[PDB]
């Protein structure tokens, strides 16, 4: 029920309308990642780098297993039971993630019976047969580099240089890995980690994982860019150095009776200066309610907005009254900079501030003039079929609305300042004035 006609004279031009949709209904798949390469074909002069690498990796892998063992002990079948007294402190998300973790024990146990086969793989991507009907994929961290570069060149240079190269490669891999799985991973129980972060254990090549898993969705790019694909760790092995990860593939669903409206701001002239209006740019309307939204966490597309969560927030009553046609309740700010927009196009109709920009009609070769009592001008083909703004020639349509648009004015609100130090100064001044008024009242 927005009043676009009144909002236009303030400098707010309507834009594109978009839909609102959120993810739901995930599916599940399991993968295995191996964090140690196979050096069987170059083992003669590998030195002692592997033992040091193992010692470094064990101290990183241990805390994750220690944190995971907490929920393993106190969850048992009974539609599952937990010992609340032993856990002590927890949140709803942690409890839900613990239930989800418990649901994967059967699959983890079935997978764990192939330890000997897992430990013998020597390729970057290997396909294993878990059962007669199900298969499991195994990925190795640095097998490709060893298979491609180090082994063929082993007989042309002294292999102390090969030892140094292998040590440097392992150190670089550890340096890249330490960012995600380090001390920052305080709570591995939750399932909010994206697949992009998880792929750092494979060198950041999540495209290979996604292609191998065989995605079969048309919204794949939108799901990937909106951070709607997540993963969870369900098992850690400290003797074979591998982990098991479960991946979730959700489905996007569209909310009914909801849309988002966009506004384009244009500067306007009131007394002798340029002003702009401070109002939200994106407005969420569902059913018959108006509220704000933080679109910074969402993905903006041409036709719809994709979010992995509901980001609605309340809105003040004065802003709601301002959006409905009460222009005298809408704040404005002074313009000091020179790089501000001064015209916009909407449905073939042109809104421009001709005080600070040239305006002449190309058809009749005459200038367009703005008086001091007007904030903006509406230009259509009723008066000027073709207009020129500097170095551009534009053809215009017909305006749908009041025929007396340029002959009627509106009211304006109070000026404001939006700087932090200015906010503090204004608060101090208002408090001092209120204190003086209270003293006089006493």
């Amino acid at each position: 029920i927005l009043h676009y006609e009144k909002l236009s004279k303030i400098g707010l031009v309507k834009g594109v309308t978009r839909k609102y949709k959120i993810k739901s209904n995930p599916l599940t798949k399991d993968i295995v990642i191996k964090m140690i390469p196979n050096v069987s074909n170059m083992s003669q002069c590998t030195g002692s780098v592997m033992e040091n690498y193992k010692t470094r990796l064990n101290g990183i892998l241990t805390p994750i297993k220690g944190a995971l063992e907490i929920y393993k002990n106190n969850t048992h079948d009974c539609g599952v039971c937990m010992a609340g007294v032993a856990i002590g402190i927890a949140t709803a998300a942690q409890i839900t993630a613990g239930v989800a973790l418990y649901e994967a024990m059967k699959n983890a146990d079935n997978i764990n019976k192939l330890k000997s086969s897992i430990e013998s793989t020597n390729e970057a991507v290997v396909k294993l047969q878990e059962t007669a009907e199900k298969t499991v994929y195994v990925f190795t961290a640095l097998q490709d580099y060893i298979n491609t570069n180090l082994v063929p060149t082993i007989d042309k240079i002294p292999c102390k240089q090969t030892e140094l190269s292998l040590d440097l490669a392992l150190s670089k891999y550890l340096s890249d890995l330490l960012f995600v799985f380090g001390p920052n991973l305080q709570d591995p129980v939750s399932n909010s980690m994206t697949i992009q972060a998880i792929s750092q254990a494979f060198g950041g090549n999540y495209e290979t994982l996604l292609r191998t898993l065989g995605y079969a969705t048309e919204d794949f790019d939108d799901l990937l860019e909106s951070d709607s694909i997540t993963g969870q760790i369900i098992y850690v092995d400290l003797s074979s150095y591998y982990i098991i990860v479960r991946v979730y593939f959700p489905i996007l669903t569209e909310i009914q009776q909801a849309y988002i409206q966009e506004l384009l701001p244009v500067s306007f002239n009131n007394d002798n200066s340029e002003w702009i209006s401070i109002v939200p740019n994106f407005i969420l309307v569902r059913n018959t309610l108006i509220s704000n939204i933080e679109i910074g966490f969402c993905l903006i597309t041409k036709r719809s907005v994709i979010c992995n969560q509901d980001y609605a927030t309340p809105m003040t009553n004065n802003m709601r009254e301002c959006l409905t046609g009460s222009t005298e309740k809408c704040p404005r700010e002074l313009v000091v900079s020179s790089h501000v927009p001064r015209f916009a196009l909407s449905n073939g109709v042109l809104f421009a501030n001709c005080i600070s920009v040239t305006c002449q009609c190309q058809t009749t070769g005459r200038a367009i003039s703005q008086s001091g009592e007007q904030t903006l001008l509406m230009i259509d083909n009723t008066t000027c079929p073709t207009a020129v703004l500097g170095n551009v020639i534009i053809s215009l349509g017909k305006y749908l609305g009041s025929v007396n648009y340029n002959s009627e004015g509106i009211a304006i609100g109070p000026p404001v300042f939006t700087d932090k130090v200015d906010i503090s100064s204004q608060i101090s001044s208002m408090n001092q004035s209120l204190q003086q008024s209270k003293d006089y009242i006493k």
Partner: antibody
Framework: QIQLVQSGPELKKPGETVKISCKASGYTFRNYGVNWVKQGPGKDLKWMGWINTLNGEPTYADDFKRRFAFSLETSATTAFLQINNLKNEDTATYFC??????????????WGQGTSVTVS | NVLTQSPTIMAASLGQKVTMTCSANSSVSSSYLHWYHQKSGASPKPLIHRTSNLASGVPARFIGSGSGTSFSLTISSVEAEDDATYYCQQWSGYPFITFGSGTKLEIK
């Protein structure tokens, strides 16, 4: 199949020299190393050292730094062991083994049949 | 790092279970211990490659366990061909290789 064959028994008088060979077949010779193990009287087992089959650089234990030397013949895939200045305590049985390593653990998967040396 | 085996000789009857021990002068990681066996007139062959992991082709009647400086080997049911000599070995790098004293098994 993988097989290691050594030379036969030999007898020598103190002050002489001895040379023992170890033939390999059935696998890629350059991909694995060779170890030497001594089994003296009393059935004790002691480790002497190993030789790299790529460069030919030998390595000796603390108790075998003086009178022992290793050599290699890549063309015939044969390894040699030579002892100088023989004495009475050298009477024992020697073994040429193989080294296996894949990143998890070390192992001596295949052994020779052994050679007996007697000093009198 | 001297490794000492307590049973110098042991006799057993068919079907009986036996246990051997393997001590260590200092602490040894569980990933560096192996077991070997040798019959008369033959070269040694691997039997167990870790504290518990069996080698290829070894019957499942051999059980190994231990931690710290004390380790042990257990046979659930002896047979006629188990009359060999067993050794405990530690290998934590090329210079650090040590063998045990060995234990001989007899059948009544």
């Amino acid at each position: 199949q993988i097989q290691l064959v050594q030379s036969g028994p030999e007898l020598k008088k103190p002050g002489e020299t001895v040379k023992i060979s170890c033939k390999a077949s059935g696998y890629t010779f350059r991909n694995y190393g060779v170890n030497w193990v001594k089994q003296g009287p009393g059935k004790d087992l002691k480790w002497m050292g190993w030789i790299n089959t790529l460069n030919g650089e030998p390595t000796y234990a603390d108790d075998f730094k003086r009178r022992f030397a290793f050599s290699l013949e890549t063309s015939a895939t044969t390894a040699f062991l030579q002892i100088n200045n023989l004495k009475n305590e050298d009477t024992a049985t020697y073994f040429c083994a193989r080294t296996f390593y894949d990143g998890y653990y070390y192992a001596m998967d295949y052994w020779g049949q052994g050679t007996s040396v007697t000093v009198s | 790092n001297v490794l000492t085996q307590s049973p110098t000789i042991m006799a057993a009857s068919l079907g009986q279970k036996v246990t051997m021990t393997c001590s260590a002068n200092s602490s040894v990681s569980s990933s560096y211990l192996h077991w070997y066996h040798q019959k008369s007139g033959a070269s040694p062959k691997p039997l167990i490659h870790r504290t518990s992991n069996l080698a290829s082709g070894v019957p499942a009647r051999f059980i190994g366990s231990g931690s710290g400086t004390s380790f042990s080997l257990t046979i659930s049911s002896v047979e006629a061909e188990d009359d060999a000599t067993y050794y405990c070995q530690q290998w934590s790098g090329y210079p650090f290789i040590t063998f045990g004293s060995g234990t001989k098994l007899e059948i009544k």
